[PDB]
Amino acid sequence: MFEKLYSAIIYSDEFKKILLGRGVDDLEIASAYIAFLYEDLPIIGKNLCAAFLRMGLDAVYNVMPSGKVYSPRHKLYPISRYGIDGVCINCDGGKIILRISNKGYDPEDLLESKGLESRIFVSKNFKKKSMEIIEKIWDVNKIRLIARKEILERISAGGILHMIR
Amino acid sequence: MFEKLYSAIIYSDEFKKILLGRGVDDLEIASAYIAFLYEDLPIIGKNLCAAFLRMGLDAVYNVMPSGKVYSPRHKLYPISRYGIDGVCINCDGGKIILRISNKGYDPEDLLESKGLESRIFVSKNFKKKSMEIIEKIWDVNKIRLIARKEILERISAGGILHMIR
Ligand SMILES: Nc1ncnc2c1ncn2[C@@H]1O[C@H](COP(=O)(O)OP(=O)(O)O)[C@@H](O)[C@H]1O
Ligand SMILES: Nc1ncnc2c1ncn2[C@@H]1O[C@H](COP(=O)(O)OP(=O)(O)O)[C@@H](O)[C@H]1O
Ligand SMILES: [Mg+2]
């Protein structure tokens, strides 16, 4: 069921390593959860994994130099424009501000949440908790090598430089 | 004895596909042969394969968006400048001019060459004949696959954006 969500988090994580030398964040992975739940909610800010969840490999063409995705068709924005009442992953604009707290949802406890509130918070170490869930269920290293080879096949289609425009 | 030369031709072909989405030219391959005979001769324009021969994976950091390499430490120059008495791959600068001809050198005959003419010529389908040699010696697919893993390993650790500077 969460097969769409956990795949996004592995693929975004590999692509981000190819593109910026590092892997996805606590809050960037959190954005994939929020979007797995509310599929017509605009995700503003650090939103790379939501963008893989909604766009597949095609997010690769829309990622800004910041790792934020602009793709208004899939309601992904890097900053808040007028009238977008979306979730702001680590920013103060939009309708709903998502950041980190001691007493903030876990990976499990967030999937459960039935409402959307004016302020959303997620637990420290959200990525570590979410990688363990995926690890117990999948062979993640077999997936990562398959992810890298497909992302490279994408990038090599028109070449890195094409993909930058 | 020629392994190092034939590895550069297979590594550059995999790297150019990742950067510009297409293989290497007849003349880009020819430049590597030249780099192999004349270890101090400066090579000007169309030098992606001579760059791998002279720099290894460290060439990825010195590629212009044209796929020409600028590394003066290694006597590699994308355009001719005053006083660089080198071979010019498919330009009219420097001292020697390398260009395709109907009668030009073969891979075997260019290797066997002893002089340095004021004008070298390589046969049409220099790349075809050169890939037909290398394919008789190794399972090239096992190489391209390794070259990719190592090219990606290099790109990734920096981040594609660090590398494009
Ligand atoms: N640079 C491009 N190259 C090829 N096709 C494109 C390009 N830009 C847009 N399209 C196409 O135009 C249509 C509109 O897409 P668009 O709304 O521009 O995408 P996005 O919401 O990701 O910015 C789509 O069918 C898409 O496939
Ligand atoms: N990880 C890296 N390892 C080695 N060289 C790098 C790396 N990242 C970037 N470079 C760049 O590659 C180039 C290779 O050296 P070169 O231009 O020949 O001599 P110099 O050291 O004088 O700049 C340098 O311009 C350097 O800034
Ligand atoms: Mg060409």
Residue numbers in the entry:
A (entry chain A), B (entry chain B): 1 to 165
Sentences from the paper on this structure:
Genome segregation is a fundamental process that preserves the genetic integrity of all organisms, but the mechanisms driving genome segregation in archaea remain enigmatic. This study delved into the unknown function of SegC (SSO0033), a novel protein thought to be involved in chromosome segregation in archaea. The segC (sso0033) gene encodes a 165-residue hypothetical protein of unknown function. SegC has a tertiary structure folding similar to those of the ThDP-binding fold superfamily, but SegC shares only 5–15% sequence identity with those proteins. Surprisingly, we found that SSO0033 exhibits nucleotide triphosphatase (NTPase) activity and assembles into filaments in the presence of nucleoside triphosphates (NTPs) and DNA.
After several trials, we determined the crystal structure by soaking apo-form crystal in crystallization solution with additional 20 mM ATP. From Fo – Fc ligand omit electron density map, we observed an additional electron density in the interface of the two dimers under the ATP-soaked condition, which was not observed in apo-form density map. Based on the shape and size of the electron density, we can only fit an ADP molecule. This indicated that the ATP molecule has been hydrolyzed to ADP. In this SegC-ADP complex structure, two residues (Tyr61 and Arg73) were found to interact with ADP. Residue Arg73 forms hydrogen-bond interactions with two phosphate groups, and residue Tyr61 is involved in a π–π stacking interaction with adenine. Since the ADP is positioned at the interface of the two dimers, we also identified two residues, Arg22 and Asp25, from different molecules. However, these two residues are located more than 4 Å away from ADP. The results showed that the NTPase activity of the SegC-Y61A mutant was increased 49% relative to wild-type SegC (SegC-WT), whereas that of SegC-R73A mutant was decreased by 35% compared to SegC-WT. In addition, the SegC-ADP complex has a different catalytic site compared to that of E1b-ThDP, and both Tyr61 and Arg73 are involved in SegC NTP hydrolysis activity, but neither is located in the ThDP catalysis site.
